[PDB]
């Protein structure tokens, strides 16, 4: 009867369909590589007590030698990168970057826009639906570690069906007390604390005894193809920086607590294979954004 | 084919090239003279009419 679902999986907004070609991917890859040099040069400048390494690196990134009074922000490369990031997030984004600028910026470094060289593990738990009987209450909280608290007020033991989707590879389940769980139309095993499940096996049935509530903690692992320069720590920081600076405030879009929740949510949708490819490019662009903004701080408190 | 080798080892004292450093410096003296001469002619002669 009752149906419960994860909050972050509901209504994934469409992603952009622009700047997804070979030349555009080279522009994103070049930006990440040159932004990395910007951070490294700034550290070296501090150690050597000379601004030459930073001035030299900023000249490659921004194609200009800065003046003292004018604030340093990155120039055309920063402008193009910031607007392209907006275009990836939603369809409604203006997408106002010319192709001449993209081609010129992609020619700064000899790098390849390969977004399928390696993989990464994304630990967000997808709970598509949890179907429960009438006298039982189910609440789902959390995304990185989902805690499903279920209480059986009914007279007899109830069966609750778990649907974790088909994208995730491994889901590990732990409970406050040992509990019974098995696949659809299969014998119930002995009560155990921990289960390791393949989400493709099928809907899973859990037995809820009458009495104290049972809380099941869930953890998932999904593998998504990403470039070899992908760094999850830098991507998350860039995602927060972009959200705070107001680059994602577009009409009719969904806001996610992490890039982990964003990429998994788009995966768990129709044409999700194509959506993930765009989201991966957005991830590397966000990684470039974080490195570039940390080396060139503008906001003051 | 007949590519000569340029040593340029005795020119550098450590990482400093004395001749290049001194040659760049005399342009600052030239810059001072250019401004000094231009202002003195402007004050001495004023607007010029032909």
């Amino acid at each position: 009867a009752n149906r419960a679902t994860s909050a972050f999986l509901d209504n994934p907004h469409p992603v952009g369909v622009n700047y997804v070609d070979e030349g555009s991917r080279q522009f994103v890859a070049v930006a990440e590589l040159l932004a990395s040099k910007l951070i490294d040069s700034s550290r070296e400048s501090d150690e050597s007590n000379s601004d030459v390494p930073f001035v030299q690196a900023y000249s490659k990134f921004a194609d200009d030698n800065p003046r003292h009074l004018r604030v340093k922000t990155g120039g055309k490369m920063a402008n193009a990168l910031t607007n392209v990031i907006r275009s990836y997030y939603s369809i409604n984004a203006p997408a106002i970057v010319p192709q001449v600028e993209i081609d010129r910026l992609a020619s700064k470094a000899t790098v390849s826009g390969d977004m399928y060289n390696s993989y990464a593990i994304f630990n967000s738990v997808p709970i598509v639906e949890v179907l429960s009987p009438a006298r039982t209450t189910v609440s789902i909280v959390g995304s990185d570690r989902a805690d499903v608290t279920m209480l059986n007020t009914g007279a007899g033991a109830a069966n609750i069906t778990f649907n974790f989707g088909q994208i995730a590879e491994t889901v590990i389940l732990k409970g406050s007390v040992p509990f019974q769980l098995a696949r659809l139309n299969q014998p119930m095993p002995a009560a155990r604390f921990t289960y390791k499940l393949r989400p493709l096996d099928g809907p899973f049935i859990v037995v809820l005894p009458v009495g104290n509530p049972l809380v099941i903690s869930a953890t998932a692992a999904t593998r998504i193809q990403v470039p070899l320069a992908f760094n999850k720590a830098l991507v998350e920081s860039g995602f927060q920086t972009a959200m705070n600076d107001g680059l994602f405030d577009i009409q009719n879009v969904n806001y996610y607590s992490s890039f982990d929740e964003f990429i998994i949510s788009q995966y768990h949708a129709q044409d999700g294979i194509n959506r993930v490819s765009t989201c991966v490019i957005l991830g590397l662009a966000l990684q470039a954004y974080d490195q570039m903004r940390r080396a060139l701080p503008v906001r003051r408190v | 084919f007949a590519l000569a080798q340029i040593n340029a080892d005795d020119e550098f004292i450590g990482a400093i090239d004395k001749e290049s450093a001194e040659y760049l410096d005399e342009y600052a003296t030239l810059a001072r003279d250019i401004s000094n001469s231009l202002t003195l002619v402007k004050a001495a002669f004023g607007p010029l009419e032909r």
């Binding site: 369909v17 622009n18 921004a62 194609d63 200009d64 604030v71 922000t73 120039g75 055309k76 920063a78 402008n79 910031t82 607007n83 907006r86 984004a93 203006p94 997408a95 106002i96 970057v97 010319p98 192709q99 001449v100 600028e101 010129r104 600076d245 107001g246 680059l247 405030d249 503008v298 906001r299 | -």
Partner: protein, 249 residues
């Protein structure tokens, strides 16, 4: 970029002869033409910068499939350097030159019902500069002569006084008029003033500066053609001659 660098009417008309219509089409999805958007301009403001998208831009935009859209994409190519997205045009049209589309009956396009006032509003004319407006009037004149609606060209010019003053003076069928023209139609070129690498606020202005800075790099690249230093290396067809004539005309 190459089209925006054409200064004379002879150079622009010669370029439209060589360039096929496929360069006017973009093949990229773009976005909706007229829409109020918030853009990021961090060099000046922290708050997002409001702007309105337009057809005359250096980026692809969605265009109508009819003959009206095809004409508009040609004009947007001449005045902005980038065209529109018109899906599934036949291969016969795409291989034809831009000048043939505007000044020949062999193509199957029917343009007799074109309204110049509607087109001028869609390709926003209050936003164009003087050189962009002159280029548009060249395209309108070529369409009028092919169609026989030369009177409709004159009534349109009389309704807008500033356009009549700056309207290029040539006969689309006589080459002698083209050679005598002294109009300057170069949107991009070598700048006498100091040009920096800073960004601009409006989408049109920022996109135009990208073309301006790109041309300077293209000017100093090896692809640029220096007449005073390599004139003997040029093919006889592409060499600058006084007797060069367009096909027909």
């Amino acid at each position: 970029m190459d089209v925006l660098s054409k200064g004379s009417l002879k150079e622009l008309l010669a370029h439209l002869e060589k360039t096929p219509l496929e360069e006017a089409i973009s093949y990229r999805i773009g976005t909706v033409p007229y829409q109020n958007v918030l853009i990021s301009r961090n060099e000046y403001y922290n708050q997002l910068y409001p702007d309105t998208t337009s057809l005359i831009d250096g980026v692809s935009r969605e265009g109508q499939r009819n003959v009206n859209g095809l004409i508009m994409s040609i004009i947007s190519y001449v005045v902005s350097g980038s065209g529109h997205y018109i899906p599934n045009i036949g291969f016969m049209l795409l291989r034809r030159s831009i000048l043939d589309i505007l000044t020949k009956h062999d193509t199957g396009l029917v343009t007799n019902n074109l309204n110049y006032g509607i087109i001028a509003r869609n390709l926003t004319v209050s936003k164009m500069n003087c050189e962009q407006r002159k280029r548009m009037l060249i395209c309108f004149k070529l369409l009028a002569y092919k169609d026989g609606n030369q009177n409709d060209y004159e009534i349109y010019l009389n309704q807008n006084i500033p356009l009549k003053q700056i309207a290029p003076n040539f006969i689309p069928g006589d080459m002698r008029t083209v050679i005598h023209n002294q109009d300057q139609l170069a949107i991009v070129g070598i700048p006498a003033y100091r040009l920096t690498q800073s960004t601009e606020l409006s989408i049109r202005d920022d996109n135009a500066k990208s073309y301006k800075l790109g041309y300077v790099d293209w000017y100093n690249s090896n692809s640029f053609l220096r007449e005073r230093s390599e004139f003997n290396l040029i093919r006889l067809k592409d060499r600058d001659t006084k007797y060069g004539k367009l096909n027909g005309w």
